[PDB]
């Protein structure tokens, strides 16, 4: 009977671990956007240099 | 042959009155071994978890 609660806690742990994935995606989106913006800023800076 | 059958009844009575439950406790002991093994498996699963 003691195994059951452990199983349930394992499931809750699975969901809690399943949230961090979407969290991580939402995170990395900002990194990608930062990369693109960095590229644009680089090009713009080159143009300013011209 | 009938007397031999009575002797067979005496032999059956001998084998029956020989011993009470013994190996049954060994089966229950095997079940207990399965319980301890399940404890090791649950402890391992707890370790991995």
What is the residue-wise DSSP string for chain B? Answer: -HHHHHHHHHHHHHHHHS--S-HHHHHHHHHHHHHHHHHHHHHHHHHH-
Q: Which residues of B touch A13 (CB under 8 A)?
A: 49
The answer to whether the beta carbons of residues A10 and B48 sit under 8 Å apart is no
Q: Nearest CA of chain A to the CA of B29: how many Å? A: 20
Identify the helix (H) or strand (E) that includes residue A50.
none
Distance CA(B34)–CA(B29), nearest Å, equals: 9
Distance CA(A41)–CA(A46), nearest Å, equals: 9
Closest CA to B41 of A48, A4, A3: A3
Distance CA(B16)–CA(B28), nearest Å, equals: 21
SS3 content of chain A, % helix, strand, coil (to 5): 95, 0, 5
- Solving technique: X-ray
Is A10's Cβ below 8 Å from some Cβ in B? yes
């Amino acid at each position: 009977m003691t195994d059951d609660d452990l199983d349930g806690e394992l499931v809750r742990l699975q969901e809690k671990k399943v949230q961090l994935e979407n969290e991580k995606l939402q995170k990395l989106s900002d990194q990608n956007l930062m990369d693109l913006n960095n590229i644009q800023f680089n090009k713009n800076l080159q143009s300013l240099k011209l | 042959v009938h007397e031999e059958i009575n002797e067979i009844s005496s032999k059956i009575e001998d084998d029956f009155l020989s011993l009470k439950n013994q190996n049954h406790w060994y089966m229950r002991t095997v079940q207990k071994s399965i319980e301890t093994l399940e404890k090791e498996v649950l402890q391992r699963k707890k370790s991995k978890k």
